DNA sequence: ATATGCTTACCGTAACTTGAAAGTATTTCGATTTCTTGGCTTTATATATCTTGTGGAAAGGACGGTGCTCGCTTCGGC
């Protein structure tokens, strides 16, 4: 069975109280009868730390270097930017050249 | 001399969009299975008759260390 949007709060609370070291004990103390890998995916999907914030200037240098080094025609491989630049997903990163 | 007036660069998530990797049903090629006939094995006295294959004969060609001292021959003597 899927979640009911009521266990992620206690999950992140226990993860912050323990230090995000061992997710197995966290899942066992949470009492969901599910594997740690099955709940960690939804935890990271509901987490906000995976995203980014207002754009700086020093990262523009790296983006321009990566473009001038591995861009082809009118297509830009933003997946390479996701691989190199941490924090940027594939959805909202394309705006960096839109 | 400055705040709200409207105007627009842009960093908040979202879905219907183009096409390559990955799971799914389907008929076709080929390999497998199952039928068919028919001889294998016993017997029966019959017995035909003509050839086959043999066999003990005839008869052949085929290959089956070192003195040591009698005596044998050949010249060879005067």
From Swiss-Prot:
Q: Which residues bind DNA?
A: 23-47
Its domain of life reads Eukaryota
HTH myb-type domain ranges (all copies) = 1-49
Q: Where in the cell is it found?
A: Nucleus
The chain positions of domain Myb-like read 50-98
Recorded disease is: Neurodevelopmental disorder with motor regression, progressive spastic paraplegia, and oromotor dysfunction: An autosomal recessive disorder characterized by delayed motor development and developmental regression after the first year of life, followed by progressive spasticity with gait alterations, paraparesis, and oromotor dysfunction. Most individuals have cerebral, cerebellar, or basal ganglia volume loss.
Q: What function is annotated for this protein?
A: Part of the SNAPc complex required for the transcription of both RNA polymerase II and III small-nuclear RNA genes. Binds to the proximal sequence element (PSE), a non-TATA-box basal promoter element common to these 2 types of genes. Recruits TBP and BRF2 to the U6 snRNA TATA box.
Q: How does it assemble?
A: Part of the SNAPc complex composed of 5 subunits: SNAPC1, SNAPC2, SNAPC3, SNAPC4 and SNAPC5. SNAPC4 interacts with SNAPC1, SNAPC2, SNAPC5, BRF2 and TBP.
Q: What is this protein called?
A: snRNA-activating protein complex subunit 4
Record organism: Homo sapiens (Human)
């Amino acid at each position: 069975q899927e979640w009911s949007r009521e266990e992620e709060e206690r999950l992140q609370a226990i993860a912050a109280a323990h230090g995000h070291l061992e997710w197995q004990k966290i899942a066992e103390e949470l009492g969901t009868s599910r594997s740690a890998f099955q709940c960690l995916q939804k935890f990271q999907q509901h987490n906000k730390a995976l995203k980014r914030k207002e754009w700086t200037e020093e990262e523009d240098r790296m983006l321009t270097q990566l473009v001038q080094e591995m861009r082809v025609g009118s297509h830009i491989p933003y997946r390479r930017i996701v691989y190199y630049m941490e924090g940027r997903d594939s959805m909202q990163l394309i705006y960096r050249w839109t």
